Amino acid sequence: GPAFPGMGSEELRLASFYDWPLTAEVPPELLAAAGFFHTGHQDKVRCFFCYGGLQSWKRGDDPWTEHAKWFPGCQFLLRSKGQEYINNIH
Ligand SMILES: CN[C@@H](C)C(=O)N[C@@H]1C=CC[C@H]2SC(C)(C)[C@@H](C(=O)Nc3cc(C)nn3-c3ccccc3)N2C1=O
Ligand SMILES: [Zn+2]
């Protein structure tokens, strides 16, 4: 199961970005779609399922791509995007 079941709702994850510092550079809609919620600190986010933490976001970073780069074992990512997608990013 998920590391943090309470952030399994996409709606709740998106709500967590109300004070995201990088709205234009990396959209909260995309981050939340990709399983991430804002911690509230700087630009640190975390996946509800694998608990993986990503910070230091650059403009145009794609949340799903970064999810697969760093946490390719995540089952939420596998379920959502498929193995071929993860394989191609590596
Ligand atoms: C350029 N695009 C960025 C999204 C990126 O590649 N991210 C970092 C690239 C350098 C190192 C990797 S290792 C990592 C997957 C664990 C992650 C990272 O450095 N995370 C981290 C380290 C520490 C001491 N805390 N956190 C962290 C980040 C976010 C939430 C909670 C904890 N990380 C990154 O977040
Ligand atoms: Zn994950």
From Swiss-Prot:
BIR repeats lie at residues 13-78. Belongs to the IAP family. This is Baculoviral IAP repeat-containing protein 7. Apoptotic regulator capable of exerting proapoptotic and anti-apoptotic activities and plays crucial roles in apoptosis, cell proliferation, and cell cycle control. Its anti-apoptotic activity is mediated through the inhibition of CASP3, CASP7 and CASP9, as well as by its E3 ubiquitin-protein ligase activity. As it is a weak caspase inhibitor, its anti-apoptotic activity is thought to be due to its ability to ubiquitinate DIABLO/SMAC targeting it for degradation thereby promoting cell survival. Disulfide bonds: none annotated. It comes from the Eukaryota. The gene is BIRC7. Binds to CASP9. Interaction with DIABLO/SMAC via the BIR domain disrupts binding to CASP9 and apoptotic suppressor activity. Interacts with TAB1. In vitro, interacts with CASP3 and CASP7 via its BIR domain. It comes from Homo sapiens (Human). Isoform 1 and isoform 2 are expressed at very low levels or not detectable in most adult tissues. Detected in adult heart, placenta, lung, lymph node, spleen and ovary, and in several carcinoma cell lines. Isoform 2 is detected in fetal kidney, heart and spleen, and at lower levels in adult brain, skeletal muscle and peripheral blood leukocytes. Autoubiquitinated and undergoes proteasome-mediated degradation. The truncated protein (tLivin) not only loses its anti-apoptotic effect but also acquires a pro-apoptotic effect. The RING domain is essential for autoubiquitination. Changing residue 61 to A: Abolishes inhibition of caspases, SMAC binding and anti-apoptotic activity. Transmembrane segments: none annotated. It is found in: Nucleus; Cytoplasm; Golgi apparatus. Zn(2+) binds at residues 47, 50, 67, 74.
